Design a binder for these strands. Structure first.
Ligand SMILES: [Mg+2]
Lengths: 70, 263, 52, 182
RNA sequence: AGGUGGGGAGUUUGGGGGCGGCACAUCUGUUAAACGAUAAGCAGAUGUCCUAAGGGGGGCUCAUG
């Protein structure tokens, strides 16, 4: 009712909903074509999906990820 | 010196064009009836009307350069030259100019049954007010010659292109009609030109929303015979239809807020 | 060279006619618009302006 | 008295230019110039067309401002006005579009260089020994100060400065002439 | 003959963005087109408010017999 609510899964390789989020980001970039630059920030409780979602978006492990909040 | 610069600024092409100036040139055979017709036409063209000093011996079909020279020296886009020959009785010529070059030529002749403005009942008429137009018959849009005549008449009498009109400004209307329909390939029937003043009869039958429209003819009454015709090339037509060029998921919402769709 | 030489490229492009604006590092990769940007990674004049 | 008007073929209206089109069949039998009823038939047809156009025209929105006479460029609130739509008929133009511009060398140099265009701050430059702004150009500027001042400590040098300024103006005119051929 | 030709070698890689701005009453050398009138510029003691445009407003008509 107030947010897009894109379903996502934080698997590094077998991610779910990655295509939808990629399309959403592409649309956002298309809206901001005149900006030529944009960044996306993550907000949430520790160990939820932040580092894992970033890594699966990159398709490889970049940020250290483990079953630990920090 | 700034006075000349102001005129030159208007001479140069403008993104938004003002009312097309009209120059009237009396020909070598400017009949008294022709002079009266010219005066009547000027009455419906003021204040953007210019008349030449005296007679002229210019033939638009046999001499195109003089018209271009006059248009360039007077900065007038519309040109009218009335000239009647023995064969072409009461002939009147109308010419358009694009970039000071000839755009098209059309010969229009008025039958002897024409009635002058003074002959009709006297009524109020304000100069500079944009009149209404009505075109009758499919030939106006389904024929090249009639389409050109309609376009010329509109450009001559459409006046300004303001987007706001006063209710009281609708003083009179011009009725554009043709002398009946014709079959394909038949001679073009003469174009009937009439001017009717508007009368606001009360809305008794029409409640309050709309009054009963009434008309009173004031003239001039003219039947336009069709003679020699000239048309511009397709490139000139395309040039004359250029635009000043003045957005996916981009829209200016109310209050000027720039909104978009996520999809 | 011959093509690798920047003189040949400048002659072909015609920039030699306006070589006064030759920016330090004018090459096919990272032209002036990029060389100047990168140079910023390499404000204390202590001037006394008249704030009138 | 009745205002009702209708035709078999729907009427085409051009509210942007106060014009309308009626493709209905024309009665050649009565439109003949020799007929007397011709004038009455034309009058009736024109009245019907004008009634239809007015009925369609009045359906447009109307502005109602809350201002007063005010300045010469204002509008009276009392005068109700109909907001006509954008024009629909593509009338031919009278002159071409002057999209052509000056290709002077300065524009190309600015595009190549990083020199941003000047902001045109103002004419009020500042000078010394006078206690006044003494704007650069526009009224008794510093350009003529060198000639006005009565001490040229360094053959008449006062005229040399004017000659140099005139030569610079001539060079600017020559550059204008050269760029005019672009 | 033409071409790739730091793959190879010698070398450096200094010590900087805005600027031009005047119009009429004048006389002098050129211009002067040469029976001349004397114009369409150059630089000059010369000012002056025309606020580097005279824009509006209210009035006058003029070389020459
Ligand atoms: Mg974590």
């Amino acid at each position: 009712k107030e947010r897009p609510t894109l379903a996502f899964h934080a698997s590094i390789t077998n991610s779910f909903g990655k295509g939808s989020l990629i399309q959403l980001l592409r649309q956002f970039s298309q809206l901001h074509t005149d900006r030529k630059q944009i960044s996306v920030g993550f907000i949430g409780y520790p160990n939820t999906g932040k580092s894992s979602i970033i890594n699966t978006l990159r398709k490889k492990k970049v940020c250290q990820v483990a079953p630990i909040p920090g | 010196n700034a006075r000349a610069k102001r005129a030159l600024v208007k001479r140069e092409a403008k993104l938004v064009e003002n009312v097309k100036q009209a120059l009237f040139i009396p020909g070598q055979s400017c009949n008294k009836n022709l002079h009266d017709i010219m005066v009547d036409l000027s009455a419906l063209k003021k204040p953007d009307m210019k008349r030449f000093n005296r007679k002229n011996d210019i033939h638009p079909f046999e001499d195109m350069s003089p018209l271009e020279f006059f248009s360039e020296k007077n900065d007038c886009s519309l040109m009218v030259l009335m000239t009647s020959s023995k064969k072409r009785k009461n002939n009147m010529t109308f010419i358009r100019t694009f970039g000071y070059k000839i755009y098209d030529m059309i010969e229009l002749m008025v039958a002897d049954n024409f009635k002058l403005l003074s002959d009709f009942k006297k009524l109020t008429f304000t100069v500079g007010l944009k009149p209404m137009f009505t075109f009758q018959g499919a030939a106006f849009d389904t024929h090249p010659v009639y389409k050109q005549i309609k376009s010329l008449f509109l450009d001559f009498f459409r006046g300004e292109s303001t987007d706001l009109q006063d209710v009281a400004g609708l003083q009179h209307v011009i009725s554009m009609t043709i002398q009946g329909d014709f079959q394909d390939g038949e001679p073009l029937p003469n174009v009937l030109f009439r001017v009717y003043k508007l009368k606001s009869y009360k809305s008794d039958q029409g409640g309050k929303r709309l009054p009963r429209i009434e008309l009173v003819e004031i003239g001039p009454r003219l039947d336009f015979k069709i003679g020699r015709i000239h048309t511009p090339s397709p490139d000139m037509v395309t040039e004359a239809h250029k635009k000043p060029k003045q957005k996916k998921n981009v829209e200016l919402d109310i209050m000027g807020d720039k909104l978009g769709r996520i999809h | 060279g011959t093509g690798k030489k920047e003189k040949s490229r400048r002659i072909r492009e015609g920039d030699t006619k306006d070589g006064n604006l030759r920016v330090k590092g004018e090459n096919f990769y990272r032209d002036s618009k990029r060389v100047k940007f990168l140079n910023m990674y390499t404000f204390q004049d202590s001037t006394i302006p008249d704030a009138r | 008295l009745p205002v009702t008007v209708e035709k078999p073929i729907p009427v085409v209206y051009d509210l942007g230019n106060l014009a309308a089109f009626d493709s209905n069949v024309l009665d050649k039998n009565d439109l003949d110039s020799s007929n007397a009823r011709r004038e009455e038939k034309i009058k009736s047809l024109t009245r019907d067309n004008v009634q239809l156009l007015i009925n369609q025209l009045l359906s447009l929105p109307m502005k109602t401002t809350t201002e007063s006479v005010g300045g010469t460029g204002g509008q009276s609130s009392v005068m109700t006005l109909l907001q006509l739509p954008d024009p629909t008929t593509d009338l031919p133009r009278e002159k071409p579009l002057p999209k052509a511009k000056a290709m002077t060398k300065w524009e190309k140099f600015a595009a190549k260089k990083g020199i941003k265009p000047k902001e045109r701050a103002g004419k009020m430059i500042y000078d010394e020994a006078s206690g006044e702004w003494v704007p650069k150009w526009g009224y008794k500027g510093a350009n003529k100060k060198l000639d006005d001042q009565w001490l040229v400590e360094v053959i008449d040098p006062r005229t040399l400065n004017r000659a140099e300024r005139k030569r610079l103006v001539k060079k600017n005119e020559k550059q204008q002439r050269r760029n005019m051929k672009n």
